[PDB]
Write a protein that binds this ligand. Structure first.
Ligand SMILES: CCCCCCCCCCCCC/C=C/[C@@H](O)[C@@H](N)COP(=O)(O)O
Length: 417
């Protein structure tokens, strides 16, 4: 009751946590025409969000261990909710204010993302704990798709795009209030040596690189596909991001389910089933992601079908990389491994993926005739680097597969002693 409600309100907070990152991505067209910026600043928004998130996350993992986790969590939520509401009133000439507010929202969300799973893990035990944490993660695809749908529908209804940013913090105030009320005051229960031991961990290194490629593809695509689809529709002379949000929710759930089923099918034949599957999914999704840019030139329904299948296949290896890190890393180094892997996946992945895609798009457009057709074509050419990164991530998962047996053998050897 007390702890099941706490888990419920923390799951709602995570829904809001992910609903506030993709509200900007679902209204990006209106932001560009309002502020007059090109693809570069549009990518810079999400890049600054992720660059602040990945730097604040370790610090809040260090502050939550020392001080009250629930106080930091509640102050974080309220803080990003306020930054989101206050930034909705930014006038036209201050785009740097909007980018800096995106960065501040990323700092606050880092507190929640870092501290809420520890609270849920400390409230529950065993299977109860495993299910509860799962419900918390269930909010990633639901939150993302709801962010897309919310931004698009609120811009459609209100006649303005700021209301996309204005409607969500009202729920964050209530979630922070109930986290003050519902969530109990739960208490707490060398890194460089662990890093020295983990750099020689070939399977951990290559799994981290594969996760970095996944993050690159996910960040760039989730930022730039709702806008690429709109440009495709305009050249093929709102709805796009609503359909994309529905697809995002359903494909996140379906991808987790299908990855679990595939690994459960492959446990009968290969000891390297966990990484190998992760590779075959990636080289699968890379076939379909590229097809997004082949179908959208002629049909948007084909683009949606390819998004569906490629997003199901890209999201299948989300829960299997955690399996690999559990398998190959001894539990004393597992916290450092998770922290460093998150930092590496952000830094080499989605911290610069949206800005890189925007910069490539702008550089293609500058050396070429300017037109809606060429806007759409330049964004497609820029986005064609996501399939290449997915191919490299599949190669890195294969390299993890070659060493999975050896590294898991040494991990079991060390934990048995
Ligand atoms: C073409 C690719 C476009 C990609 C766009 C991505 C935009 C952001 C979407 C983020 C989706 C995350 C998917 C992960 C899902 C799992 O963590 C949960 N479903 C686990 O919860 P459980 O299901 O176990 O309850």
């Amino acid at each position: 009751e007390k702890r099941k409600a706490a888990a419920a309100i923390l799951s709602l907070g995570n829904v809001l946590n992910y609903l506030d990152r993709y509200t900007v991505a679902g209204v990006l067209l209106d932001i560009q025409q309002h502020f007059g910026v090109k693809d570069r600043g549009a990518g810079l928004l999400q890049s600054v969000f992720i660059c602040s998130f990945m730097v604040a996350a370790p610090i809040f993992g260090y502050l939550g261990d020392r001080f009250n986790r629930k106080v930091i969590l509640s102050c974080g939520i309220f803080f990003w909710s306020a930054v989101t509401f206050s930034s909705s009133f930014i006038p036209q000439q201050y785009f740097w204010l909007l980018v800096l507010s995106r960065g501040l929202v990323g700092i606050g969300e880092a507190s929640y993302s870092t501290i809420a799973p520890t609270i849920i893990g400390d409230l529950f035990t065993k299977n109860t704990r495993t299910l509860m944490l799962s419900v918390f993660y269930f909010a990633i695809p639901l939150g993302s798709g709801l962010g897309y749908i919310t931004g698009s529908s609120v811009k459609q209804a209100a006649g303005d795009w700021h209301w996309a940013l204005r409607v969500s913090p009202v729920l964050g105030m209530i979630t922070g209030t109930l986290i003050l009320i519902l969530v109990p005051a739960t208490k707490r229960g060398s890194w460089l040596r662990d890093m020295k031991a983990l750099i020689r961990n070939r399977s951990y290194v290559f799994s981290s690189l594969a996760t970095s490629a996944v993050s690159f593809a996910t960040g760039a695509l989730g930022m730039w596909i709702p806008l690429y689809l709109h440009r495709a529709q305009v050249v093929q002379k709102a709805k796009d991001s609503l359909i994309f949000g529905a697809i995002t929710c359903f494909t996140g759930f379906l991808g987790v389910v299908t990855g679990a089923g595939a690994t459960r099918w492959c446990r009968l034949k290969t000891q390297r089933a966990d990484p190998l599957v992760c590779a075959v999914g990636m080289l699968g999704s890379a076939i379909f992601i590229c097809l997004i840019f082949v179908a959208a030139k002629s049909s948007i329904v084909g683009a949606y079908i390819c998004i569906f299948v490629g997003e199901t296949l890209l999201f299948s290896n989300w829960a299997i990389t955690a399996d690999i890190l559990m398998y190959v890393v001894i539990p004393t180094r597992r916290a450092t491994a998770v922290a460093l892997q998150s930092f590496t996946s952000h830094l080499l992945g989605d911290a610069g993926s949206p800005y890189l895609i925007g910069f490539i798009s702008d550089l293609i457009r500058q050396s070429t005739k300017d037109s809606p057709l060429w806007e759409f074509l330049s964004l497609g050419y820029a986005l064609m680097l996501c399939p290449f990164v997915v191919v490299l991530g599949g190669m890195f998962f294969l390299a993890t597969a070659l060493f999975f047996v050896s590294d898991r053998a040494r991990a079991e050897q060390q934990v048995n002693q």
